[PDB]
Amino acid sequence: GASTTIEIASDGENLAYDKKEFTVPTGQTITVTFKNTSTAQQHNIVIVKGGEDVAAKVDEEAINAGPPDFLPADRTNIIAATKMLGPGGSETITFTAPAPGTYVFLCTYPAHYAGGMKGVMTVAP
Ligand SMILES: [Cl-]
Ligand SMILES: [Cl-]
Ligand SMILES: [Cu+2]
């Protein structure tokens, strides 16, 4: 199940990814390519350091941070994040997988996380 190279995309015009979960091996370099395949939406992907409580706080810092990237000033709670992609844009991010555990991924464009645009990165031991 575990993989070091992940391809993920938005689903149509909905506030959802085409993957709700993926697994990565701990301690190794991971490549994640996100494609905003929508025709009219803004999307990113943010992998946070922990679960739903961390994700909620990053989402709130994001909407306060505002346009155009909607990300917090620093990455203390972020494993990796793309920039805010327009329709048809894509980005590839790179990070050492952290300690084994479950890590929420989410889009921080306003209302999209609450709208269900989220998933879980499981990090295998
Ligand atoms: Cl692999
Ligand atoms: Cl972003
Ligand atoms: Cu989004």
What CATH class is the domain 1-125?
A: mainly beta
CB 3 within 8 A of CB 100: no
Which of 122, 105, 111 has the alpha carbon at shortest distance from 45?
105
CB 72 within 8 A of CB 65: yes
CB 45 within 8 A of CB 107: yes
Residue 112 known to bind ligand: yes
Residue 107 known to bind ligand: yes
Omega prior to 110 cis, within 30 of 0 = no
Residue 73 known to bind ligand: no
CB 9 within 8 A of CB 75: no
Distance CA 33, CA 85 (A): 12
List of E strands, the chain: 5-9, 21-25, 29-35, 46-48, 78-81, 90-96, 101-106, 118-124
Ligand in nearest proximity to the CA of 110: 3
Distance CA 83, CA 70 (A): 8
Q: What is the DSSP string of 101-122?
A: EEEEEE--STTTTTTT-EEEEE
Ligand in nearest proximity to the CA of 85: 2
**Ligand 3 centroid vs 125 CA: distance in angstroms?**
30
Ligand in nearest proximity to the CA of 12: 3
Q: Is 96 exposed, middle or buried (0-12, 13-18, 19+ CB in 10 A)?
A: exposed
**Ligand 1 centroid vs 47 CA: distance in angstroms?**
19
Indicate which technique resolved this structure. X-ray
- Resolution of the experimental model in angstroms, please? 2.2
Question: How many CA atoms lie less than 13 Å away from 36 in the CB half-sphere?
Answer: 20
The type of residue at 44 is: N
**Ligand 2 centroid vs 92 CA: distance in angstroms?**
12
